[PDB]
Symmetry: C6
Subunit: 102 residues, 6 copies
């Protein structure tokens, strides 16, 4: 169950990134992380090939944000279980309904 991530500079772009990712494939948006200096990341979980398609769409679609900018992106095909318990990449009760349709 891969994890996919798009970090942008600026909030409107991260919202476009989120929207494009879940529309382009069967992935679940599981969170949004702010780390300062305007850098915010959206995080999806799903089958790796779905996640790869999501992230590509997300990256492409930030291009249509006026002032949007992608700072970094990464996919991990098979994240180690320890990561879920420390980093905010885990599903929450709030998004359980979407994890279903994957």
């Amino acid at each position: 169950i891969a994890v996919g991530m798009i970090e942008t500079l600026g909030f409107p772009a991260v919202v476009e990134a989120a929207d494009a990712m879940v529309k382009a494939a069967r992935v679940t948006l599981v969170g949004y992380e702010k780390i300062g200096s305007g850098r915010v990341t959206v995080i999806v979980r799903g089958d790796v090939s779905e996640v790869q398609a999501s992230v590509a769409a997300g990256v492409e679609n930030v291009k249509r944000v006026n002032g949007g900018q992608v700072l970094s992106t990464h996919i991990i095909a098979r994240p180690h279980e320890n990561l879920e318990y420390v980093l905010p990449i885990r599903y929450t009760e709030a998004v359980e309904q979407f994890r279903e349709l994957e």
Copy 2:
């Protein structure tokens, strides 16, 4: 359309002006204000896609009147996937529903 419209400014006074202009210019509801550090704050409206287009364009014009204001980014999402409302601050909150209840 249940579009979402967003304007991100540098500076708080400009963002208050962007929100005030957007809700005056069309039938949209201001639902959120997000800070992501570094002086960047975004206000978020929801409504019909053509109303949101008008709001965002008005917000951008009106921030021009602000002494020291600046728009950093804007965007409209025409049909926000239902997953977004659960993770990102783009939904009506109880406070805004109080406002809407006055009608």
Copy 3:
């Protein structure tokens, strides 16, 4: 309607002076102090629009005299839409209700 006026400064001492000068210059209530990171802070006052206009002028002039003070932006909205009060920190709160009455 009740106008809203705001002065945003780079530095906390300057924002305290801005607030102090605003409430002393005219009949306005200080209702908000907003921090958005990176040293940028804003004080927000509410009152009749002409009082708010006098206050904000006073605030900007007194910041200029703070050792290290700097105003980054200022703005006045004569008739803020009612939706704003439910989302942005511009509203009167119970803690400043006493000063609201002093306005009139």
Copy 4:
């Protein structure tokens, strides 16, 4: 009851600024405020003439801090009552023993 403030870049300078202020005159250190970009402010209250002396000393001492630096300072002699309900400059319970020791001039 005046309010005196020194904003520094960096936290060790702000602690020195606080220490020099309360040692130089009978005022009370009531708080410290962080607003991002490494800017932190310490805040004292007291009689205006005592606060003047505290702030002068805090500014002198911060110059001895390895790497520290004052960014801004300011004293408001007779802060309006409204300020206290919105800005973080209030006395708190925790410092009332020092408030009692302030020297006032009538």
Copy 5:
């Protein structure tokens, strides 16, 4: 003595890759994620010192595969003083207990 290894990146996707490479490269425990503002975030692993050296070596190497990745700083303390845990966010916690049990020594 249980070493502590740290990799600080500018940006969240790189920190997540650093963490993943660290726990895959050796038998250590990822115990924390610290944000200090300005984009700087750190991940912290604990375990035997030769394992922590391999984890930290691998996290640093894997951050290069992150598009837009940057490592800002890295450090390993072989035998961290006992005071450190009670003040700094480097402690083991219940949430990662299952992974501490799997550590190599």
Copy 6:
């Protein structure tokens, strides 16, 4: 007088090294870790003034050998005024009482 020693660094790994080298160098207690944003983080030790002087000097040297650490500022106050502890994060807590006893 229980003196107070501080080292502020750029970056979390360097602050952990600063802390570590300080409590290893002399008889002081690590009581505090303060973040003020912009990557600036400060660690705070308490102890006898001559013990604090040695801790701070060691912490500065060891920080400079960290990969990417910088010492942004340091300072030592020999006899901090009583008022400081009720306002700033420099006091002992229960959590490190065990190490105070050891000075």
